[PDB]
Design a protein around this ligand. Sequence first.
Ligand SMILES: OC[C@H]1O[C@@H](O[C@H]2[C@H](O)[C@@H](O)[C@H](O[C@H]3[C@H](O)[C@@H](O)[C@H](O[C@H]4[C@H](O)[C@@H](O)[C@H](O)O[C@@H]4CO)O[C@@H]3CO)O[C@@H]2CO)[C@H](O)[C@@H](O)[C@@H]1O
Length: 330
Amino acid sequence: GWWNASDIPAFDKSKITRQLPLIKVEGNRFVDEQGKTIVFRGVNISDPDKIDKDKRFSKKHFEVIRSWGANVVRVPVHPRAWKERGVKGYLELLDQVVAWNNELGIYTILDWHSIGNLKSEMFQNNSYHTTKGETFDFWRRVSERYNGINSVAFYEIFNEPTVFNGRLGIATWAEWKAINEEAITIIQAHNPKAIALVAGFNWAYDLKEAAANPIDRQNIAYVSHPYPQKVGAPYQANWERDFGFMADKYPVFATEIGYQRATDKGAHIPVIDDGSYGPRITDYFNSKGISWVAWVFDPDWSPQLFTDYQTYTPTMQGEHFRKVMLQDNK
Ligand SMILES: OC[C@H]1O[C@@H](O[C@H]2[C@H](O)[C@@H](O)[C@H](O[C@H]3[C@H](O)[C@@H](O)[C@H](O[C@H]4[C@H](O)[C@@H](O)[C@H](O)O[C@@H]4CO)O[C@@H]3CO)O[C@@H]2CO)[C@H](O)[C@@H](O)[C@@H]1O
């Protein structure tokens, strides 16, 4: 594993030729060098490990992302792929995504893509299995190697915290705050410009517990994954109550949203919807200044943003998020 990893090279500086502007948090906003507010709207790729196995791992794929108007790309590093490639093999993919995004002008979010209760080591399935030690070691290596590369602006500590109603144990917000604080200290000690993205429970949906007892670190923003079936009923009023109101105080980065019909490929709760969710959520996010990232720019993982690699034809949700990214990104 990670505890074996022998002499990993440093990032190859010759792979990039420009420095994107520095992003930072100021009160509830992301701002640039000049103090201008920046709202990010982007896509998740699938795991670089899958893209490479698909024989699609080249700059071309990221150039398509750029033509869809995205100004950020989230990279979901699965602990299973990190173990299968090994640290050295995996960093060879990850350095290429970082370099490509950098040359295309696109910011990167590094996402440690597990689901469940890290404190008790119970995960939604083995694809996500890790440990506190492996997670800290990952944050330590990536914050060390990408230090000073401004496009690597966001470090998303742990994709979706959930206890699944006790099926995955017990972990209070207080205990999850302390774990995020240690990860943030590691990351900031390697990379002082790093912005950490922190999530709460119900699969990174809730921010009420965070609001009542916020992470004690600076330059932090908060995550929500408000998929179509997280709540029904009056949608906006429910979203505002569960996580949206947080955006009046800290920036909120909604690092997954997506939807597809009951009959679409891989359709599953909570992503099923007639289609009215797309306009409704990007309007609501515009009303709150909330950044977001659609899931997933891949033709297999569900819900898909496009139908196949031959054409990159957008699906229903792809068409809508592409139109809004082209139109609203500044
Ligand atoms: O990771 C590769 C794999 O990913 C799938 O996409 C996932 C993302 O990895 C993940 O971040 C996220 O997870 C889902 C989660 O899998 C669901 O089990 C969970 O469902 C909850 C729901 O949120 C509750 O409100 C309801 O009460 O309970 C159910 C469980 O009973 O919801 C979260 C999201 O909230 O996002 C993606 C789902 O699109 C790919 O789709 C898959 O094809 C790939 O292997």
